[PDB]
Structures are given as C-alpha cells and as structure tokens.
Amino acid sequence: QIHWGNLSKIGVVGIGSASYKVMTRSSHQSLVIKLMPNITLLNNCTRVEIAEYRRLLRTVLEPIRDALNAMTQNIRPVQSV
Amino acid sequence: QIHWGNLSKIGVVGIGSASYKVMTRSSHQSLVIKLMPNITLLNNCTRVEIAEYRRLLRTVLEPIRDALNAMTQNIRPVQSV
Amino acid sequence: QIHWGNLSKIGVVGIGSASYKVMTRSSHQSLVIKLMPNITLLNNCTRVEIAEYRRLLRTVLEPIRDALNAMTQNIRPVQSV
Amino acid sequence: GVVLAGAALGVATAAQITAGIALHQSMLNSQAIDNLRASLETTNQAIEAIRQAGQGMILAVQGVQDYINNELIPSMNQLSCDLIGQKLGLKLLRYYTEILSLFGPSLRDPISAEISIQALSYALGGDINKVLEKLGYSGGDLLGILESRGIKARITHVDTESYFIVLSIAYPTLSEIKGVIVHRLEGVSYNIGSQEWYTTVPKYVATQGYLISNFDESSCTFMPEGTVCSQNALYPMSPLLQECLRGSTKSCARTLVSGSFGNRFILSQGNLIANCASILCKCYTTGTIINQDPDKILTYIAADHCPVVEVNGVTIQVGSRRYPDAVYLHRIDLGPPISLGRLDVGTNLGNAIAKLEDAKELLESSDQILRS
Amino acid sequence: GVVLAGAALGVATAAQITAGIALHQSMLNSQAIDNLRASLETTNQAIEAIRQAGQGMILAVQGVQDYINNELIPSMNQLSCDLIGQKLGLKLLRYYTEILSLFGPSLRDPISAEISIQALSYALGGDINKVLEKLGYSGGDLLGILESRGIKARITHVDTESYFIVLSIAYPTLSEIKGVIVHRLEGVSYNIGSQEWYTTVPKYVATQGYLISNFDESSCTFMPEGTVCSQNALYPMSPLLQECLRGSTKSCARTLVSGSFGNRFILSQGNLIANCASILCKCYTTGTIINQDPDKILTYIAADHCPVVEVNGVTIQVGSRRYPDAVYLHRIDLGPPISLGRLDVGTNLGNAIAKLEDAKELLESSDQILRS
Amino acid sequence: GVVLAGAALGVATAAQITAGIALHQSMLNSQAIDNLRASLETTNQAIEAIRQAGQGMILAVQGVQDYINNELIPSMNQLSCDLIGQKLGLKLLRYYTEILSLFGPSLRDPISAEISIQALSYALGGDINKVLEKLGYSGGDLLGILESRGIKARITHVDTESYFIVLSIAYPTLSEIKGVIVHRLEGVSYNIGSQEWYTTVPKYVATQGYLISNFDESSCTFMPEGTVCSQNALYPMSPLLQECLRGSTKSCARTLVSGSFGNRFILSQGNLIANCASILCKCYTTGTIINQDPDKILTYIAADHCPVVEVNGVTIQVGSRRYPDAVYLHRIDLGPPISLGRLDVGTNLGNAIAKLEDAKELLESSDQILRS
Numbered sequence A, B, C: 001q002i003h004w005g006n007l008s009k010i011g012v013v014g015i016g017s018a019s020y021k022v023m024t025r026s027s028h029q030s031l032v033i034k035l036m037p038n039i040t041l042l043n044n045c046t047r048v049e050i051a052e053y054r055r056l057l058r059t060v061l062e063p064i065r066d067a068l069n070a071m072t073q074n075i076r077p078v079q080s081v
Numbered sequence D, E, F: 001g002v003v004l005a006g007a008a009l010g011v012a013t014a015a016q017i018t019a020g021i022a023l024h025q026s027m028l029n030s031q032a033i034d035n036l037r038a039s040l041e042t043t044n045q046a047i048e049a050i051r052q053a054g055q056g057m058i059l060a061v062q063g064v065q066d067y068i069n070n071e072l073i074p075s076m077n078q079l080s081c082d083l084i085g086q087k088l089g090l091k092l093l094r095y096y097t098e099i100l101s102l103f104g105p106s107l108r109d110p111i112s113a114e115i116s117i118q119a120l121s122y123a124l125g126g127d128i129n130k131v132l133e134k135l136g137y138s139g140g141d142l143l144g145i146l147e148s149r150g151i152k153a154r155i156t157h158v159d160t161e162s163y164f165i166v167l168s169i170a171y172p173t174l175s176e177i178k179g180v181i182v183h184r185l186e187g188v189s190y191n192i193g194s195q196e197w198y199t200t201v202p203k204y205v206a207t208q209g210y211l212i213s214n215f216d217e218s219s220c221t222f223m224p225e226g227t228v229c230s231q232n233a234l235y236p237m238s239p240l241l242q243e244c245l246r247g248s249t250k251s252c253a254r255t256l257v258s259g260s261f262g263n264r265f266i267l268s269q270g271n272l273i274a275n276c277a278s279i280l281c282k283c284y285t286t287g288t289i290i291n292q293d294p295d296k297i298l299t300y301i302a303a304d305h306c307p308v309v310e311v312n313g314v315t316i317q318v319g320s321r322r323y324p325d326a327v328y329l330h331r332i333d334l335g336p337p338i339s340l341g342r343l344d345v346g347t348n349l350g351n352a353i354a355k356l357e358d359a360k361e362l363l364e365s366s367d368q369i370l371r372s
C-alpha cells in the first residue's frame, strides 16, 4: 500500500483520509411540468401572448415526443418470444 | 477510408453519421444599444441615480471609443494612393 | 533574451509587451452579512416563513462555526511559551 | 475602396486588419449619427425600429425601459418621489454591471471581437426573442444557428456624448461541405483473461474521400438534417491515429477501465456485441448461458445462434448475422496500453525522456555501429 | 416483461437500451395520462400533488403561477388590460428561453439524458426547496446528496396537445464501499542547491487492500462522515505512478516551481516539515536560525531540537519527534524532471519521438547485435 | 503575538496555518461582537455602516431588506397578510439557496478560503457597486483590480444565535516587478510544398534579463497601463521550449493546420509577413501577382518592392524594409511535427514507450557496446 515513509522524504504527506460512499436508486416519483398557466382570473388580457407562447413551445416539444415514440415502438411483450 | 471490419474486432462501431454545414454571412443589420432611458414621465425623481449611472458608463465607454478612433485614423481612401 | 530574428523566419512575431503588476494587501475592513431581516413594519405576516428560513440557515452556519472554533482554540498567547 | 496605413499602424493581426477594414463598410456616416442621435432622443419603448428613409433599418433597444414603463410609471401617483429614485437606481446599477461585464477591460481587442446574441441578452432587456423577431431573423434553421451561437454582433460606433453603442449583427447562411461526413464512434470493453480493456478512439471523426480528420463538436449542434457548426470544426489528426482508423489495430491505444464500466455491450446492425466475460449473457429462448471463451475477447450475437438474448436483465431480440463469429486473440494484433490522465502522462513521459537521455551516446552512434 | 426489437431499432448504445426499457416501467399508462390531463386543467397553484389512488402520487409544477397569483391577479383592478398582457408576455418569453435551454437541440439524447434537480430550478419556478419538501426528499444526507448533483430526472412523456412534460425523479440511497479509503495528499518544496523542486502527485488517491487507483473528485462532496460521490470516482492509475506511491522515489516525477511558491512548510503529525533553504526558519526558544545544509533537501523540525519554531513570521509549537532527521541527498533516488503544460509536453514529446525515428534502423537490428 | 499548537492541531497546510494565525488579528474582539449584535438589531437598511467610536468602521449588508422596504412595506395596506408572507417566503428561499451555494458543503476549508467580492454579489443584495462605494474602495486602479477579482473576503466570525457572518475584506495595492516584461506572441502559417504548417509557441511569455518563463493569464487583466494579475502568473518553462524562444528553430514544434486557417498574414514593424502560397498576394502599385518560390516558406513585403499590396481582399500600405527578405528552406532548420490533442498525445506516447520496452536489452548493453 502507500509507503508514507519514502513519500515524506520527498516532501509528500497525507493530510486526511475518508470513506467512499456511492448512490443507488430504489424508488421513483413522477414530476410533471405543467407548461400552460391557469390564466382564468386574468380575463382575456393575455390571448396574444399566450398564443405566441404555445407556438414557441411546439418547436421544442415535438422533436422530443418523436424521440420517445421512436423508442416505445420497439418495445414488445416478452410473450411473443 | 474507415475500416469498420477491424474496428469492430476491438469493440469500436459507428452509431451514426451526418452531413457537415458551416456558416457564411452576407447582409448585416445595425443594432444600437440606447444606454440612457426615457425618464420624462418620472418627473425629476431620479436625477441623482441617472447622473451616477452616467458617471459609471463613461469609465467603460471612453476606452472603447479611443480604440475605434485609433483604427479609423489608419483607414484612408484608395484614390489618394 | 528572445531572438526575434529567428522567430520571424518561422512565422512568429511579437505583437505587444507590457509590465507586470501583482497585488499586496496591508489594511483590512470588516464586512458583516446580516442574515436576519428587519420585519417590524410587516406586522406578523411572515412568522412561519421566517422561522422556516432560520431552520434552513442553522444547517449551514453551525458546521462553519465549529471549524472556526477548532482552529481558534489552538491559538495561544506567545508569552505562555 | 480604402487602404490601411500599415506603416502608421505598425503591428496588427489578420483578424484586426480584416475587422478594421470591415469597420469602414459597417460604420454609419456622420450624417446618420446625427440623425440617429435625434431619433434616439424621441423614443420611449424597449424595442423600436428606426427607419431612415433611403438607408437600412436600425433597431434601438433600451435595457431598463420595460421596468420604467410597466412598473415605475404606473406607480407614480401612489409612491413617494424618493422611493421611485431608489427603485430605478437599483436597476441602473445592475444594468451597469452587465455593461461592465460585457464591454469592460475583460473584453480584449474590441475591434476584432465578436459577441454572440445570447451574451447580449441582459443588455437587450433580459430576453432576445423579440429582438430576433424585429430583426426579421426566422426560418427553419433558426434553432440550429442559435444553439450553435451563430448570430454574432460587432461594435462599430461608441457615442460618449449621447451614451449609445452601435452594433453590426448578421444572420448567417448555412452551406454544406461536399464530400464531408461526420461519424460518431462508440466503444465496447473486452477482456484479456481477467483484465477489462477499452480502445481509445475519438468521439467524432470526419472523412472526405481518403482523408480522415479530427472533429471539434464544441461549436456544433447536431440537428436531424445535419450538424451545424458556427466555427471550423475540422482539424488535423495525427498520422498514427489515422492508421488506427484505417484498419491497423496495433496502432490503436487501449486503456484499463474502472470496475463499474457501463459500456460492456452495444447493439449494431441488429446484432449485439457484448463482453460476455464481464456481463451475464443468457440465451432467452433456450435458457442457456452464453459463455465467452478465454481465448476470445468479444462475443458477436446474432439470430442464427440466439434469436432472443438477455444481457443485463434487459431482453433483446436480434436479427440476422452481420458480424462474423469472434476470432481468437492470436489473430488480433493489439495496441499499447496507455493512461490518458495529465499526471500519468507526465510521469510516463518523464520516464521515457530520461531513458532516451541516458542512452543518447549509443543512439547518436548508430550509423557507425550498423556498418561494422 | 418487455423485449427490445434490436433488428428494428438497428443501432443503440447500452445507455440508450437501458433507459429505453426503463420507460416501460416508469411511464404512466394511457388511462393515467388521460386522467392526468384532466387534473392538470383544474389546478391553479405553482405546486400541487395529484392523488390518483392506485398509482403513485404526481407532483405538478407551474413555472409562472407564482407571478400570476402574487403580482398580476391582485393588481387586476388597478392596471389596464393591455399592460397585464405585456407583463405576462415578458415572463413567458424568459420561461420559454429556459425551456429551450433545457430541452432544445442542445439536449442531445432525450431518452438517456439525466437532468439534475438544480438545472431544473428555473423550470420549476426559480427555487427547488419547496419541491424537495413536497417530494418527501429529506434526511441527514440531503446536503451531501444535493451538492453532489445526485437527484436526477428522466423524461418519460411529452404531451404536445396539452403542453406538459412528465419526469421520473429519484432520491438515491448512500452506501459505503467496503475497504476503500480516499487519501488527500499535500506537498512542500525542497531545494537541490539553488533550485527549488516539487514532487508531482495526485491531489486524491484511493486504496483498496493493496490496490491503488486514481480518484476523480469532480462528482464528489467531502462530508464529515465520508466522501459522497454521485458517479463512480475511482479510475485506474498507471503502473509507474503506482510504483511512486509504493515507495519508489525514482519513479516519482518532479517539477520546478515559481520564485513565489506557497508550499514551503507543512505541519504533519505534530512536526513541521519545511524547506529551510527557501524560507526563514528560526528557533524561537534560543533565537538561533535553523540553517539547512546543501547536502540535505528538507528539514524535519521536532521538539527535541526546537520546542518553538518561527517560519514565515508564524510562531508554532511542535510535539515529539515522529519523523527522522533529514537524510542526505545521496541516499535519495530522485526522479525525472518534467513540465506538465500541454505545449511543453508536445514540444518534448515531439522531440523524443523524432529521436526514435533516427534510431529506427538501429532498434530493428537489436537481436542481431545482441546475439553477436 | 500568538503561537500555534501544532501538537494539538496535528496536521495543517501552510495556507491553513497562515490563515489560522491571521484570524487572530482580524477577529473583532469579544467585546465588539457583543456590541455588534446590538447594533445589527436596530438597523432596517440594506447597507449601513456601524460607527462604534474608537474602532474601525463595519459595513452591515442585509440581502433582502431592499425588497422589504421598497416592495412589501408600501403594499401592506392593499395586500393581505397571507400574500405578504408568500412573497417574502419566495425571496427568503432563493436567498437561502445562494447562502447554501456560497457557504455550504461545496465550500472546502472555510478558514483558508478566499471569496471574491463578485461571488458575494447575490448575498450582498445582487450588486456590489454600493458596497464598494461605502467601503471607500475607489481610484484609478479599480477597473483592473476588480476584473482580476483581487478584492477578496475571508470568514472571520459566525454567530448562530443572531444569524450573521463577519467577513474580512481588503483592497489590494499594485506593485510592479522590476525587470519583468510580458510578451504577446502571434504566429503566421507557412508552406512546405503543398502543406501549411504552424509553429507551436505560447500565447504569452515573460522575461527577466536572461530568464524566460511561461505566463498564466488566467488571473490577469491586460490594462492599457500594464498587466494586473491577482495571482502569481509566472511559472517555469521547460528547457527545450526555452531554446526555441532563444533562437533554436529546430527546438520549436510545428503542426499541420485546418484547410481554412485564419492566420496567413501579419503586419509587423510596418511590414507584412504573409504566406502568399495559401492566400493571393498582389502588388497594387504595378498590378502584378506576388508569387512565392517553392524553396521559400514565407513572404516579407516592404515598400522597397511593393508600396501598396492587396492581400486576401484587403489593400494595405507598407513602410520601409525592417525584415530581411525571405531565405530558402535549406537555410532554416525546422522542428518536429506534433499533435496537441489529448488522444493524439496518448496514442503517440503509447507507441513511443512500447518501442522503448521492446528495446530494453539493447539499451542496458550500451556500456559493453560503447566501450568495446
């Protein structure tokens, strides 16, 4: 293992030691990002801004949906095997 | 080219290829950063804050303007030469 | 020193020189971060939010104070030796 | 046309000379500056297009005007005059820090400096979507250009008297380089006895006919219709690394991996390439475990031997054979083991240099000794 | 149980395969999506828990609802209708910019992408403390887990019709790896005549029995009760650097330091190890200066010779001797001198390689020369 | 005067020992801490100086007080009690996150840690300009000092009873190092046959009489009056690269460049050094093309041969000759071709070491071979 005697003779020392801990995942929860705000109490003062907001989101969300679909079409039950 | 036969014998494979596009620029627009806000309707309620804001701006603007003039004085019409 | 003559024959030139300045410090000031806001004019509308704020802070401040106490208790007057 | 007074300028780089000459084409004439100054001291909006009839359009952006128009002005009749100044003063000082951060002494070489539109976000009021719209910058390539930082601004005029900066902004055009393919590479570990190894190859490589070169992905964005790069992504590859990619396995370096390596199998051409001596390979249909022979380093699983395979608790159905059966280790010439870390390289390079230094006498006497 | 159609998928990384199968178990069923869509379209709060009995609790986060509920709605009777839209429109565009930053073309592979909870802070409304509380994530290890970026989310469902994204979030559990110790190393300089040198060693190393490996601290947090790492931090160390750490000093590389080096003394085991040829070492008890002989490279100060020592103007009391008196330079085998900079490496590597081709004919006539 | 008890402390670095002792003279004494706590209780301002007679001024900063006085207090008559708490709670949690970010477990070794004033911006209320004004930190060197991040803070006292942190802050003064010149280097490509090469040199180098060293510009700010560095920027240069800069051209390494290189001409001392074999060089005064001999690698254009030259589409005027006109390639000894990429280095280093292992028996047979 580490030879601390020779290491000190060229000016190298240990100033600390500690245990090593890693992470493992057991349970998962669902976190949903509701992208569309509730604007009912804002009457109709935000129609144009909301409508612009949805258009910008579609150009981002649609590519992600296609990637998910392109993977879940290749998932088949093991009963067919 | 790339010898995919030998690369796979040591566990190297290609997982995708794509075309290469670069950028070239033809037309240019002008965007001006107006640093001094229109404060007419604030009714002289921000005089000290505006003046201190201007004082700090001058310390940044002058060195850049000096650099631009130093290069511009070296640009001369080709008809003279 | 630097042989600019040989450097130019392989396409290396100097494009500017400057003096070197470092930093030294002699006087120090005290800057205190007051973590507890004055909320007297807010009546008592923030009791729970403030109390929850204090609880989060102690989990950060206590380990820092313990480190300072550990080093300070190892500082002793010079006349004692 | 114009001529640079290079004798008077003295020293300048190609970037400085080019941007200096381009400053002649991009600067407004003094008459426009006078009209622009009068136009600027008439607007009260955060974004406004100023159209000087007969000349190109100029966009004017005020970075704290929304706050004044939306927050401070409506509050005029119910707040004290002193609080209004404190609220504006807070925003002005925060705005100055951004201007200092962007245009201060950290900005080296203002003449030849190119500033991305995203870095201008705070100076433009916090968001850039409205600016791109008013600039007319839109289309199907906007995302690829914007994410790769392809919209650059350049300083052309600085007005100390009226406190404004003129920028020159351009919306680029995408052009395909003919005959250039960017290949993405991935690797799988293999076992030699009980040691798990990994071949060291670049993540991305580019080809153009016979030529193979390195590829820098930092400025690129991988769009579904092709990679979009705002700089030059191609740069030379060492001749020895090119021999690796051309089929010389002895030219490829290899490195040991940690005990929790997570690239022990891959799916390629409908076939599974797995280090079955390092992960559990079982044939799902028959239930028998697929053993990796000690004289082999990899396993190439296809449907002709196992139509459905479980690899790490994941069941995979594989197609027809596109990769031959694994060959023996004695038919594969393997490359040199290496360590890629900075301190490991230095320790090993220092050892090699010292060995060359100590034997310098004999190496510098080769021609005579081989002619005895 | 599910199977992957590898022939249809064609090519896939191990990370892609594992993450893709995990979608089967971590997705909401087609009916749960329909009920989720109804539940989302009746909430009006920034954070809300959706209790669908028979299925796990769902946490709904709206990124701009605090602004609407706290700022816009109360100010409804005092602001004009047009100003309300302008104020919300500003927040929506900034929120879109952050969504584009997270999930746009820079997000390379959405399927196997892992996003830390900190990176989602703006998408969740700016702060994550209330979310961590509502998720039930708490305990004594949260600070170590949180600061290691250990709480990761996966994209499981993206709904374009009702504009929401479903994420799979998990709170890790910490486990100690048996027999692994992470060592922190520090060094001080030493003089060989008039030259000041430094040994080149890693900042952190890890041991397991007789095994020595590198330790990557990038993903780790050093807590009082152990180092908490969100990734695998151990990676192999080259055999030559392992010889160094096993006591072979000649295998250890060394580098010169600048004239204003900061590591010239260290307190270790109650003793002071100092380079007394490059700093001022004075014995406070007697006032006699401690001088380092040129045949010695370091000074090992203990109480048997100086109860109180002053170095660099700092007065220190030391304990009993636990390091030997310094041995002469001729009893230390020192390693090669190296320069760690990439350009210094390339200049020296290119010179060393060039010397190898000049001897290539010599090195091939090896067995011929040695046998004869 | 104080002594450190190294026997009780056990182990500590020089930075820890130095910062530990310096804490003695920088801590407000136990009497002032009691007086400070009473003074902090009576304030209601974001920034305020504590004037306790006979002792130095202390600046107290409250990070959310501006929001309370400006935003919440004026609206107490129009909002509800619950909404007031909800708004402040949002700001408190965001402030706590920044405190956790600054002073949490990521903060390794709080005693020896130095935090720049810019990093404390959010903790101080989002801006440092007013804090610097009331600290008295001003003058003609502020811009260079601030951008180099030279205004550092250290934790002095932490009170968990009244929840405050005391920091020690210092305004540095600048000192020139006599005889040190920082040189900026720039390169131009040359051609050998059809290949375009580039010498590999550092961006910045520094000299001190005879000695040359590397320069690290990471902490520096190149101001018009000189280079201001907040750390030690000088670090040693390898002997071989020192020979390169002293006039040995074969010691300098060189790399092939990409096909779209942007450094093919430079203006230096009023003359243009241009490749002219990868870019078009044309003499304006006569209309002729400046052709480069294949036995030459560069062109040195001066007014004695071409008063006005058009290169790469830019027309430049040049002065009298101040560079000798180019010499033939046979009169220049060039250096080794190298590749600077990490993977290219590892591949070539691994190959070079392997040839050394394969030739061991010959290398330790040198003394028999050389003597006999």
Ligand SMILES: *[C@@H]1O[C@H](CO)[C@@H](O[C@@H]2O[C@H](CO)[C@@H](O[C@@H]3O[C@H](CO[C@H]4O[C@H](CO)[C@@H](O)[C@H](O)[C@@H]4O)[C@@H](O)[C@H](O[C@H]4O[C@H](CO)[C@@H](O)[C@H](O)[C@@H]4O)[C@@H]3O)[C@H](O)[C@H]2NC(C)=O)[C@H](O)[C@H]1NC(C)=O
Residues within 6 Å of the ligand: B003, B006, D246, D247, D248, D249, D331, D332, D333, E364
């Ligand atoms: C895809 O992958 C395969 C499998 O590796 C490659 O085949 C290898 O190709 C390399 C490079 O051409 C071969 O290496 C060279 O082999 C030559 C033939 O050696 C035979 O004869 C010797 C007699 O002593 C036998 O010991 C040996 O087993 C072989 O049967 C040698 O001439 C070469 O050695 C020379 O190397 C250098 C020359 O620069 C100098 O040191 C000496 O001159 C020395 O003699 C060299 O070893 C290798 O043998 C092949 N592997 C095999 C056959 O298993 C394919 O080339 C590759 N595909 C493509 C398209 O490249």
Ligand SMILES: *[C@@H]1O[C@H](CO)[C@@H](O[C@@H]2O[C@H](CO)[C@@H](O[C@@H]3O[C@H](CO[C@H]4O[C@H](CO)[C@@H](O)[C@H](O)[C@@H]4O)[C@@H](O)[C@H](O[C@H]4O[C@H](CO)[C@@H](O)[C@H](O)[C@@H]4O)[C@@H]3O)[C@H](O)[C@H]2NC(C)=O)[C@H](O)[C@H]1NC(C)=O
Residues within 6 Å of the ligand: C003, C006, F246, F247, F248, F249, F331, F332, F333
């Ligand atoms: C600016 O740049 C110039 C050139 O770019 C430098 O000039 C070099 O100076 C060095 C040092 O003086 C020269 O190196 C020595 O050159 C001598 C000339 O060699 C003659 O003989 C050989 C054999 O036929 C021919 O190849 C050569 O052309 C000459 O006819 C030799 O005496 C030296 O040989 C040495 O060889 C080995 C080296 O491994 C040693 O062991 C031997 O003992 C012996 O000394 C040596 O080569 C170098 O040649 C010059 N470069 C040239 C001429 O291109 C300037 O020094 C430089 N300025 C600065 C300040 O650095």
Ligand SMILES: *[C@@H]1O[C@H](CO)[C@@H](O[C@@H]2O[C@H](CO)[C@@H](O[C@@H]3O[C@H](CO)[C@@H](O)[C@H](O)[C@@H]3O)[C@H](O)[C@H]2NC(C)=O)[C@H](O)[C@H]1NC(C)=O
Residues within 6 Å of the ligand: A003, A006, E246, E247, E248, E249, E330, E331, E332, E333
């Ligand atoms: C701790 O450090 C000491 C001091 O360097 C180490 O002793 C050194 O050991 C090496 C190899 O064991 C010796 O080299 C050997 O020399 C003999 C003589 O020719 C030869 O048999 C071998 O081929 C080899 O070259 C070296 O001389 C010796 N140092 C001194 C100063 O004598 C010791 O090994 C270290 N301990 C550990 C556990 O690493």
Ligand SMILES: *[C@@H]1O[C@H](CO)[C@@H](O[C@@H]2O[C@H](CO)[C@@H](O)[C@H](O)[C@H]2NC(C)=O)[C@H](O)[C@H]1NC(C)=O
Residues within 6 Å of the ligand: B038, B039, B040, B041, D040, D041, D042, D043, D044
């Ligand atoms: C600040 O903005 C005000 C508007 O609030 C500007 O006043 C208008 O300026 C235009 C421009 O020509 C005039 O046509 C309008 O008649 C003005 N309207 C009002 C109500 O005064 C004003 O010019 C701006 N002030 C500056 C920039 O200093």
Ligand SMILES: *[C@@H]1O[C@H](CO)[C@@H](O[C@@H]2O[C@H](CO)[C@@H](O)[C@H](O)[C@H]2NC(C)=O)[C@H](O)[C@H]1NC(C)=O
Residues within 6 Å of the ligand: A038, A039, A040, A041, E040, E041, E042, E043, E044
């Ligand atoms: C927006 O929020 C409002 C509340 O402001 C929601 O209306 C409530 O819906 C719930 C769900 O069943 C009912 O129990 C309440 O009675 C409703 N409130 C009132 C005042 O009637 C509404 O559903 C939301 N609208 C959306 C999301 O479009």
Ligand SMILES: *[C@@H]1O[C@H](CO)[C@@H](O[C@@H]2O[C@H](CO)[C@@H](O)[C@H](O)[C@H]2NC(C)=O)[C@H](O)[C@H]1NC(C)=O
Residues within 6 Å of the ligand: C038, C039, C040, C041, F041, F042, F043, F044
């Ligand atoms: C919080 O602020 C209040 C005012 O908002 C402070 O009360 C003032 O305290 C000063 C300091 O002595 C006195 O001069 C004033 O007369 C006080 N004002 C009023 C209206 O009583 C208070 O001290 C601050 N701190 C707290 C409550 O802890």
Ligand SMILES: *[C@@H]1O[C@H](CO)[C@@H](O)[C@H](O)[C@H]1NC(C)=O
Residues within 6 Å of the ligand: A043, A044
């Ligand atoms: C808003 O517009 C919609 C669509 O016509 C309708 O609910 C109604 O007209 C408005 N509702 C309000 C103002 O609450």
Ligand SMILES: *[C@@H]1O[C@H](CO)[C@@H](O)[C@H](O)[C@H]1NC(C)=O
Residues within 6 Å of the ligand: B043, B044
């Ligand atoms: C602000 O002060 C100026 C004098 O500089 C005056 O002309 C103007 O009317 C004032 N604005 C008001 C009173 O709203």
